[PDB]
RNA sequence: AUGGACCGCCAGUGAUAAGUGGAAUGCCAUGUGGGCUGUCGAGCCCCACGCACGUGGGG
């Protein structure tokens, strides 16, 4: 499981709260505290690797193993923290679902995030389209017999280079489970 | 006439030249134009003739020149010719009458007194507003405007040697902006290529409109 | 085999972490264990000899020689340690390859990393341009009857001293075993 | 120009071959920045016209 970093540089905006007391003395209105908390915002990119082999052998069985895979893939796309989210909801859904099946070594797109994101304008389908240049040209330059799916929340463009478009991210989950038995 | 931006730098590190004094600066918009005609009548107002404004003063300047005679650039310049260059007519759709325009004057209102141990003065004041009767009574029947008065100080010229150059005096220039009514089409045209006010070498006079 | 270090100073990134707990005995929100792990991050600069001379005595054979440095190579790109894996999928492909084959000394490209770069901007790029540019000066300086070849995974920049750019890193390699 | 004067310790050398620091990890639970507000006369010089109130041109 990897750490999620943004594909562009964010500094920090300090956020200056206060905290009043909803009853009144003379002499005074001074709040009940008064502080600053940090927040970010951004689109973050996310990864994570799934050693089938050995998770069979931890699991013994093949279909248990396909079980939790598929929930496990499931659960990461579905869930966010529940880390500052009470006064912030931040809940969201990935706007990039990219499943591979690979069957020499696991390969993650981070490199593709190194030269930083100059903005003023959206940031979901440069990322997008610049990790579909990646994943291209790194198709192109490690040739493998893989099986390759995604799912995206943007039909502007059109990805070719990540694989059979499928129509949902349950949908790409199950058939990319399924194609991974 | 026609227009051009321009941005002139310091000649050296050591501000040498030219943005240290006005009259280098003016120099510096004289020595562009080589060739340069003037005729002159009994107290008209003067078309010889260049025009120029200046937006801001913390990158060494940033100018606009609008004049007759062909802008040509010189040592520690643009990148290129300009920074641009184009013609202007104001023949253009005609600037209809009775159509509006915006515009943006600079000015200098003054009225003129006598002063003790003089050799009488002009002074940059004219309660209750004067400025506004100032320029709009200067503003003859063609495209009139709106009067943005301020309060505020100051601009100095200092010479840098030369002879038959300005020595050292301060002036007031407001900055009226706003959108020109059109009254007259020729009387705000030869009002523009002229030149709005005495001192036409020390930005004071140039007009710019636009369209709706 | 040569160490691999980053071609842009990188400093260490403290990394606050905790271990939550289940099973609360007060409803306090105090967890099982706090921590602070050191991690960083970089783009890494590697660099590797094989003296086939020494290797056809080893192997004695010419045959199993090639085998095995074909394989020494592709396993060279392919793999990443599995040093603090499994919490951080730092699994990756060279963004940029070389092989040159040399018939009088090995040589490393170390010197034209010395000055580190200053960032702010990408870092690939960068490096990929300036190594072709040190190839290139070297090139002309220590002149040689070597072959050169390289794969990429940017089609932005030529690297023109790198040799001729083969197709994929299998490629380079086989076509760079085969010249030896 | 002194128990001093003159006066070379000194010609040769691989420290060498081998090596994962490695497995595990929510920093969290709570917050008004607030009450109040029209932006409306000394300036240096020259020349021109002037009803001696001033007006315009070039520095």
Known sequence: ?181 | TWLTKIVPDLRYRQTRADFRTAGNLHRKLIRLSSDLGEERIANPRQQSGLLFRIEETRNELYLLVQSHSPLRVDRLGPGYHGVQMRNLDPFLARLDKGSRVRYRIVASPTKRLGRSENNTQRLGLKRGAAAEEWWHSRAAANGLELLSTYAQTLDDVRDPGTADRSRKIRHPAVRFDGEAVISDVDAVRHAVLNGIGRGKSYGCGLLSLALI
């Open chain 1, 1 to 181: 499981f990897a750490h999620a970093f943004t594909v562009h540089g964010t500094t920090v905006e300090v956020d200056f709260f206060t905290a009043v007391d909803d009853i009144p003395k003379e002499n005074d209105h001074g709040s009940g505290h008064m502080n600053a908390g940090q927040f970010s915002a951004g689109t973050f990119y996310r990864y994570a690797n799934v050693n089938l082999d050995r998770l069979v052998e931890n699991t013994g069985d093949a279909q248990t193993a396909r079980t939790a895979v598929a929930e496990f893939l499931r659960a990461f796309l579905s869930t966010v923290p529940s880390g500052k989210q009470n006064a912030t909801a931040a809940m969201t859904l990935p706007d990039l679902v990219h499943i591979a099946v690979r069957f020499d070594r696991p390969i993650s797109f981070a490199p593709a995030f190194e030269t930083a994101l100059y903005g003023s304008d959206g940031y979901t389908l440069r990322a997008c389209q610049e990790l579909n240049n990646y994943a291209e040209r790194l198709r192109e330059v490690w040739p493998d017999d893989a099986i390759r799916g995604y799912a995206t929340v943007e039909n502007k463009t059109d990805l070719a280079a990540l694989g059979e478009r499928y129509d949902s991210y349950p949908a790409l989950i199950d058939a990319m489970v399924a194609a991974a038995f």
